[PDB]
Structures are given as C-alpha cells and as structure tokens.
Amino acid sequence: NIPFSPPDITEAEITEVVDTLRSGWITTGPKTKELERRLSLYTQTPKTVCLNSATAALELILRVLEVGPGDEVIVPAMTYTASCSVITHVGATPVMVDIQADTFEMDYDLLEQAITEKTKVIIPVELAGIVCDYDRLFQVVEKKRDFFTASSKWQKAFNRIVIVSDSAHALGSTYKGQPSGSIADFTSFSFHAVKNFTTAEGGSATWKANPVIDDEEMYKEFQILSLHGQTKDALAKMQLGSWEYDIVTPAYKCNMTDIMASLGLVQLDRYPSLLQRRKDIVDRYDSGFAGSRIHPLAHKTETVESSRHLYITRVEGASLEERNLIIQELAKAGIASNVHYKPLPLLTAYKNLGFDMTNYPKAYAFFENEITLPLHTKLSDEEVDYIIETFKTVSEKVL
C-alpha cells in the first residue's frame, strides 16, 4: 500500500528541534537567521527571507513590488491555485495564459500577446521541479519594455515586467547550471510536508543579485511585512530596555519559527543525498516506461536538471473518463496517485471571476490524460518496479 508523499524525517531533525525547544528561542530566532544564510548560499542569492508558507512568500513579493488594483499579473492556466490566489489577495487582476502542446510551460507567443500597459509581473511555475525557459521569458519582457510604466518604488528600480518564480517544487533545481532562486527576479519556495525539502509548513522568498537592489533594505521590508509592520529605531535597540517600536503599515503575520528552521537546517544538510535518491527513482521509472504509452515529463534536459519533485506522466490516447478509471485501478492495486492539475478555469473560484476553460485548450489537454506517480524518498526499488509494471498493465487493460 504505497502512499503518495510521506515525510522523510530522521532523528537528526528531531534532535535539532528538541535543541530549539530547550533554548529561549522557540519562534523566530538564531536558527531561522542561520537557515536564511545557508539557503542563500545554496540558491546562489544574497539574502533569503524564511516565512510560514510559499503562499506567504509569493504574496509578500507582490506587496513589496506594490502590485495592486488596476495592475495585471500573468500566470499559467496550468498550475496550483496558490500561484494565482495571491494575485487576487493584493487586489490585482490575474491574466491567465495557455500552455504549450509538449509541456506545462506557457506558450510564450500567447504570453507576449497577453502583455498590456497594466502588466506588472509574470509568475512562471517550475512544475515538478522543471525550470521554465527563462532566456525566452527575459527576451519577452525586454521586448515589451515601454508597455511598462513604473507605478511604485521598486517597480522604478526595474523598468520592466518583473519575473517572479513560483519555485514551490524547485528548491535544488537548476537552469543552465544556475540554481533556482538565482534566475528569476524574485523566487518563492515551499517547505510544506509533501515537498522535497520540508519544515512541515514553511517557505522562503529570495531574489537574484541586481545592482539596483540594496539587499539589506529589501530584506528589512520583508521582515516588516511579515511581523505586523513592526520597526525599531537605532536608539531604541541600543537601550537596555528596548521596548519602544512603531508600526509603519498594518501588515501580516507569516514569520518562521526556529522549530521549523531546525527542521530546515537538518533537511538542507541531508538534501543532496535526497536529491540523488530522487534522481535514481526517476531514472528507474524512465527505463520502465520507455517505449510505452506512458509519457513522463523529462526531469533531465539540455537546459534543466530538475529537483524531481513530481513524476508527472501523460498517457497517450486516454480520455478524461479513461484517466479517472486508471487512477482508481491504480488504487485497487495499492498505488496512490494524483493529478497535477485541474487547469485553473475548471475551479469554481476562477470560473466565478470569469475565467473560461475553452480559452485554454492546451491546458485542458495536459490535464485530461495526466497522472502523477509517487516520487518520494521512502519508496523502495521494489515498489518502483511494481508501480511501473502495474501502471503499464492497468493502462493496457483500460484501453
């Protein structure tokens, strides 16, 4: 009975959390700070802001950029709701763009056509750990510069559409040897229970090195937005009784605890071997399914080395009904599986805001025959062999 995504937690993680629980710092403290430092080294970015979710990280990026009512934010039609929800939270207008025929990525021609005078941010999603075609994306925003008009402080520092990576799945992924985090202008990460790297709940915001961003000043802004808008002046912090503070904006509550950071520090030590195990599982699946009607998204390309978060596959010539039936047959054989994703316009939330599935047929076609197999580091080679064999047999029989 093979589960889809159980957590891989050892005694080292437990010992580190216990150490936090014997200290005076059980919420944001020295270990969150240390995790930020070490994650910045790993993602090859100057500073990292650890928070309580990727959804928090993604939303604060937008709030730092002061994206708001009147502004537009392009998102793929094929993604998880959290990529798009944050756009509605800040009051901006989501603009969905349909995807390509071979891949989850946005059709970049349609992306170009979708850009307007109101466009402030593109949010590509590094689905399953596979990083998007960023050469193409930066080409597009440069080309469409002068549609852009800066209506905020940080928008002025860039003078173009800002690319913000939804890297929820992509910690440790690379694009042309560069780590995710260091490619897009801003990037958000998830450390949710079911991700490769986890703090049960948690996430981060980072940004690549850019001459027009003071990194300390940018970090201070995230911190302020994450901890109720609280600031202290230099006088108040020097004083022995440092009680006095101001609230500059009526902000949010999404800081990371040293409980979560503890988990993070140990996960990050163990992460390169967890990636290797994930690599070995994917390669064994790839052999197994070669020459079959089961077509996996490629986690190793000319440009990309994926984190290998999700084993997304599509079954050739399978209808919606036939897909649903395969998944149930997989479960009767004790193999959990999933679907990434219903395109956003199938969801009641986005229907209700006027998004219609017929404008994004490639997204629907991706969804129709998609099946995600288990990919985690508690799977054995025998379980992988069984999933391969069963999935091939169950698909044959249904067809």
Place this chain on the structure above:
Amino acid sequence: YNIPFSPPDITEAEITEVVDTLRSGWITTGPKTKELERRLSLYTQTPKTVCLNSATAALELILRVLEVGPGDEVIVPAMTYTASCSVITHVGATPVMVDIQADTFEMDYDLLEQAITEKTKVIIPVELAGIVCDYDRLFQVVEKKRDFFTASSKWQKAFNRIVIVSDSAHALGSTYKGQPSGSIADFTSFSFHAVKNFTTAEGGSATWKANPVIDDEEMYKEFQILSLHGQTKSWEYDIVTPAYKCNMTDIMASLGLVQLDRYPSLLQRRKDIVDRYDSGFAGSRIHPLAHKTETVESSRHLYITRVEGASLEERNLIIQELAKAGIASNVHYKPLPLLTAYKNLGFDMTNYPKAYAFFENEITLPLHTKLSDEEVDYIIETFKTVSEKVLTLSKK
C-alpha cells in the same frame, strides 16, 4: 538578577510529544490538531474550535467568514495591540476607534454607542492582560442599536445585530461570571504565541459560542476552507474561493496538547505570583490592573501597572532604571493613533485622551511561570525604590 520578560515555559513532555509527531506520517495538520480542537472546545465550553497559525489569522478569518469588507465598519479600542486592528484593514473594512475609560483599559461604552452606525458590523473588544470586558454592557449596546444593522451576508443574517468578536489573545482560561472566555462573545480568537500563557511558539484558534442558528459543522468547514487555499473535496477537489494558508501543524498541536494538560497548574502559579505582587504594591503609587474582580477571574497574562503622578519622560526613565537593576519590563500599549500606520490612515491621538493617559504612565512587569518568589520580591522592592528615586530627581 537578570529577569527576562516572557521566556517560554517548555518541558520534556512537550518535546516528547513533538518528537512523536515527527516520527508519524503527519507533520502538518493531522490527528493531533483535530484532538487539540476537541479538547480546547471542552475547555472553552464551545462546540467547535479551529486551530490556526496565529490569532491574527483567526481574527481575520472570523471577519472573512462574516464577509466584512469595503463599506463596512468595525469598532476597536484605541488601546490595544495593532493585530486587533490590522485585520480590519486587510479585509478592506473601515476601522472605527473608540476611546477608553479613566480607570480601566475597557472602551467607554457611551462612546461605543455613539460610534455605532448603519455600516457597523463587528465590535472587537480586547481582553487585555486576561481581564475580560463588561459583556453584559456590550450585549446591551448591540441590542440597543439593533435597528441600525442590516445583514449584508449569509452569516451576518444568523445574527441580526452587530457581532461581538473577542480578541482573547491573552485570555485563554479567563472567565466572566464563571463562563470561560470563548463562550461569552459571538466569536473569539486566541493566541498561542511564544510569549503567551499557553503557547505553540506560533499558533492560535477561532471559536464561537453555542447558538441555535449556527450549524457548527458547517461553520467549521468554512474556516477550514479559508485556511487551506479554498480546497474542498479520490484525487478530485475544487477550490471555491482563492483563499489563504494558515492551518496549524501537528508539530504545534503537539505542544498545545501538553500545554493544555499543564495549564491549570500554570494558571495557579500565575495566580500566586499576581497575589504576591498585589500585597507588595498595596498602599504604593504603583497601581496594578485587577486580575480578580466581582465579574472576572483573569488568565493573568500581563501584570499591567500604572504609576501615579508619573509623566511620559519619567515612565521611560523608570523602565531603563528597572533594566539597570536587571528587571525587564514593557509597555502595553502605545495607543493605536500614536503608530505611524494608523496616523497615516487619519487617526489622531487627540481624539482619544484617556487612551493616551493610560499609556503615559503604564509599566508592565514580568509575569511568567519561570519567575521565582525571590525574583518577584526583588521586582516589588526595586520598582518601589526606582519610582521613588525618579520622582525625587524630577522634583529637584
């Protein structure tokens, strides 16, 4: 002596419970959060409880469940923490601040009446330091102004009046006329932040008192949906609304389950500390807010005191002198209109002079369950001497 203001009280039992969660398959929201909700509902005498990642999340989702938004008004005291008021601006509603009484943190209820309009949807009283507000008076007020109210949402229709939502961040275990906090106001939000009496390092809850016109399961489902991206549901699920991410992990719940077992003895210790302070300061110019009244038995979260005849400058000086003697202290609170955030939205400190007068001479002493009776004795004695000296230097 170097006495900290609010260190966390964490034992091996809490660590063993978290470790147990870390060996299970459920490291985020799982069976222990569910169990914590159940047990908290029994403790607060409410039917259902929603455990979340902060009181700020709990308070904000209450507002979003009630569909409080642009055009609506929410009354809050001028004397409170920013989190009481921030959530009002987050949903797009308009905050209405009301000044407080001369003797106490509570809103002046005459001014509260006058502040109510056709737009008013919610009053958020704050149970400051664990002291629960005058709810007989508050329900009298909303009932009196009942014709001003019109329900412009589903859950507003269940009440047909202004909804009272308790900011009980400090008040888990407090009671008003024998009733537990949680069971008095229409909705109540709790904080389990590191510095609170009951803690999960970060965490909180929303609950609501028993009301015939609220299906409790249906209300709970709505909170869950808003807390976990709008998801409802065997792969298939729908997202009904583009919602939020504020669920509680079984890591935090673990801490909660053990804290709740230990909580009645932590309250008793806090009771003993407060009583020793009360003796110490009797007949002095140090005037504590009362944690035991005719109506209230406080959780005893904060030992709020005001020093009679101390100016702003003299107060700031006392706090630093307290620190030179190794006694940490704090101020609850700057009135909201002193804060840059609320200044910028047009709130002006001169409309709330009682709130300012409360702030001016307020000093909060340490009240936590790592304090010894010797440390309490030293704080009593020092605070009396440091106040005497600061006033003598000023007269000179």
